[PDB]
Ligand binder design. Structure first.
Ligand SMILES: *S[C@@H]1O[C@@H](CO)[C@H](O)[C@@H](O)[C@@H]1O
Ligand SMILES: *S[C@@H]1O[C@@H](CO)[C@H](O)[C@@H](O)[C@@H]1O
Ligand SMILES: [Cl-]
Lengths: 302, 302
């Protein structure tokens, strides 16, 4: 019993974290096989971040300018390239701790774990979610850049995120491991703003299902609703619109609990219209949206 | 910027998790040097857990009855003993992945990370706190028993918790790595109840300091208070009494923010008497008490 915001074990990723230093800037990199991946703004000074021409700034750099340190050993850069907003440093040694891995571009609403690093050294791990506006609400300080987000299915690590920037609002923006930013953001120190951050409705419903499984049932009402009717309430409260795909994904949870999906939608509707009246669900006074339906099943079964 | 409930990287502990099987029961063990540590109720059936005589049940067991499997390799038990409520299986091979480690008995109010396992396989990591009533609010399902809680300072892993039981109320109780239970609990399937669970006042104050550091300042009032006066409010709301030691520990945070401790106590007093009025602090509608003063400093500095 009990429900916590659990992150995947981070060991397989700890063994891939390195320190990349270009000039005076040191950030974290990801060493997989014979390639180190890092944010390309490692090649930028302070003046550069205003409006950097990354192509021109890379022309002034050679292999020996990129200092890659794994633990206390130094790595020999035999090649370097730029893929979108990520720099790929080819080293002469394959990482002996490379796990089975793939690069994945996740969708808004999906969850993943973050290993937050500083100078190629792990500091902590936490579970977060890609917000619908393609931002992440994490904990990143200077030097964190190059910190990676990942999932693990069996022995396969799916890297999906690399931290790049902290927006002026305090949220965070990054790329997939191919250097493509999530959202409209660019790796420049300019005026960038996220859109409306909506609540991931399907995740809230999964979390309400977890609550029922764990004993918290007070929110369960005597009513039901329709998908169109519920989506009307969702818009007024800036909730993601619920599709039939979303309903289909919660099937396994609806089966385990004996609670229809539209029945749970009617309980959530009441919670948005009336609030919690000071009560708590799973030790939280807000509706939590950073647990996917797959996360609830995986935690309740493990 | 940003504040998350961060757990220590779990890699050093992942390499120590093994699967112990005695009879039909399989739970997790901790392999350090040439000793495997596991809950002693591994030697118990279902009838036994009612009122087990662990000494008599161990007399019926020999070294070859304890099956210890690390990954896909089997370990040779050359000795076995019982220390309080933990079983120490001496194996013939030292764990090559043993980190620098020590056994620590933490105090109520302290935090630690938990690597939740099942059959010696990691499933997830999360950050929790020893409640003042010596329980922990985690996520443990059958087979989780033997899951360990730890801290990491530099390269030193301080193991402080091993999961043993889930109480009828849904909270969890366990031991230090010397087999001594936290709290009055016993490893029997009997009627055991935790006392009043109070809120860790010093941790809430640390969290309010983190909020200020991150921009959330609305709770900051124009008032102050005294230690005796505040403790009066703490008792009415089942908050831990605040000592001068607690005030001294928050010194570094009071220095960084320029907010006196008794000034922050007066803001918390208002929050307990009036509530949040629907507002949120660091994305939470409740007062969070699972961040120690040392945790806030470590996260804001890392
Ligand atoms: S990580 C991903 O899947 C694994 C199997 O789970 C394969 O071994 C890898 O080659 C692949 O990238
Ligand atoms: S883990 C603890 O401290 C370390 C140093 O940080 C020592 O090396 C260990 O022997 C000790 O148990
Ligand atoms: Cl909350």
């Amino acid at each position: 019993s009990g429900f916590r915001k659990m992150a995947f074990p981070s060991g397989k990723v700890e063994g891939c974290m390195v320190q990349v230093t270009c000039g005076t800037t040191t950030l974290n990199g990801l060493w997989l096989d014979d390639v180190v991946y890092c944010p390309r703004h490692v090649i930028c000074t302070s003046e550069d971040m205003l409006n950097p021409n990354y192509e021109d700034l890379l022309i002034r750099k050679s292999n020996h300018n990129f200092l890659v340190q794994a633990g206390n050993v130094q790595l020999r850069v035999i090649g370097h390239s730029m893929q979108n907003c990520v720099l790929k440093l080819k080293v002469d040694t394959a990482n002996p701790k490379t796990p089975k891995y793939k690069f994945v571009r996740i969708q808004p609403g999906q969850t993943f774990s973050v290993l937050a690093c500083y100078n190629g050294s792990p500091s902590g791990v936490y579970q977060c979610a890609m917000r619908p506006n393609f931002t992440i609400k994490g904990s990143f300080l200077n030097g964190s850049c190059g910190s990676v987000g990942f999932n693990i299915d069996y022995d396969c690590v799916s890297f999906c995120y690399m931290h790049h920037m902290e927006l002026p609002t305090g949220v965070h923006a990054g790329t997939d491991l191919e250097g493509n930013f999530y959202g409209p953001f660019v790796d420049r120190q300019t005026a960038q703003a996220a859109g409306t951050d909506t609540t991931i409705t399907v995740n809230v419903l999964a979390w309400l299902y977890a609550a029922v499984i764990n004993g918290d049932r007070w929110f369960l009402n005597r009513f039901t609703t329709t998908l169109n009717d519920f989506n009307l309430v969702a818009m007024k409260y800036n909730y993601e619109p619920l599709t039939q795909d979303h309903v289909d994904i919660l099937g396994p949870l609806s089966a385990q609990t004996g609670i229809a999906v539209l029945d749970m939608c009617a309980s959530l509707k009441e919670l948005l219209q009336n609030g919690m009246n000071g009560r708590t669900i799973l030790g939280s006074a807000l509706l939590e949206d950073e647990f996917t339906p797959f996360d609830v099943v995986r935690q309740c079964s493990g």
